[model samples]
Target: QESVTMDGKQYSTIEVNGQTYLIPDNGSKKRVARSLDSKVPQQTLRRGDVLMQGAASPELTVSGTLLVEADDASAKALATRHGLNFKQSSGGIALLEAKPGTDLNAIATKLKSEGVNVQIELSGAEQQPK
Candidate 1:
């Protein structure tokens, strides 16, 4: 079962196929909305979270993810090459953040050649201004 509470009120709880679920408050409203996967960590987006699409802004901020299995000297060098900072996560996965315009494919190829497993999460570009 999963649940979240806001304010002093208790939202309704429902069950589906033996699993329990708590619904979000209906009266609460959001000014800007983004299309996100239901399985994302946060149900609502915050200042630095990924925003897929919207017309509210003319410019967009982008970032990339790099996963390095080993935290050896080679991994550190790879991070430097992409100007990214790496943080260790569970299951030997290292989450890395990089600038929008970085060439992730090139970085991944180089890292793989050095015997490090790498994955890339690329960001999309914003629409051009009129």
Candidate 2:
């Protein structure tokens, strides 16, 4: 379990398997959660992380990459079952590219439920010129 503070409130976080749940500081019932790869320094997207949209229609393509921390065989097996392309990078990261119109949030949840640490990238962000 870990803790983080935002504004003037403190929140608690607990991890079971690979998913981490961040409880709210307020009395609300809402909570934020995601799968975190302990091997990586950070398992969630942060500032400066890039997100790009493929050249496909919005209705036909809701594709995105899910970065996982796992071996090539495990990643490949999951990708095959999910109809996605799996590639293990040199930095010990497993990248899965989903099919068109795939629901990203659901996919992330599924991966986390299966005990795979995952992070997803967003699209349609306004990029500044170099």
Candidate 3:
């Protein structure tokens, strides 16, 4: 069952090999931050800002950047509603910040149970060390 968060804040999208997901798991609360350039930055859909979403080819690492404006309220709201913790990058991008001590294995299990259709694309097979 493809289940989304209680609110529309959390969602999953089609990605290569499997679906890539974003959630509010940053180790800290959301906050305003700065970019190295002499300009302000914010979450997506705040105001005067445009969210540019991108992904690395053949991978499922989708990311977004806030440009030309600051304070991305929409993005921040989505994160907060879902109890997500994230960070503002020097370039003003909000990415999934995993909570410290977050057990990735457990998270993956939950996601799979939630209908992520996970697949292991990377090699983890190994022969005995002998």
In order, what lDDT does every prediction score? 0.67, 0.71, 0.42
What value of lDDT does candidate 3 attain over all alpha carbons?
0.42
Top candidate when judged by TM-score against the true structure: 2
Distance from true location, Cα of 81 in model 2, Å: 0.6
What TM-score, to 2 decimals, does candidate 2 have?
Answer: 0.44
| lDDT of each residue in 36-65, candidate 3, tens digit only | 765566568655876677654542332222
When superposed on Cα atoms, how far off is each prediction in RMSD? 37.9, 41.9, 49.8
Query: TM-score per candidate, in order?
Result: 0.38, 0.44, 0.20
Clashes of 1: 0
In model 3, which regions exceed 4 Å deviation?
1-95, 117-130
**Can you list the residue pairs that collide in candidate 1?**
none
Span of 10 residues, lowest total lDDT, candidate 3: 61-70
Q: Could you give candidate 1's per-residue lDDT for residues 2-75 as a string of tens digits?
A: 88876775778666688966778857677678896677565666568677788675554457677777654645
TM-score of model 3 (CA atoms): 0.20
Which portions of model 1 show Cα errors greater than 4 Å?
Answer: 1-62, 72-77, 122-130
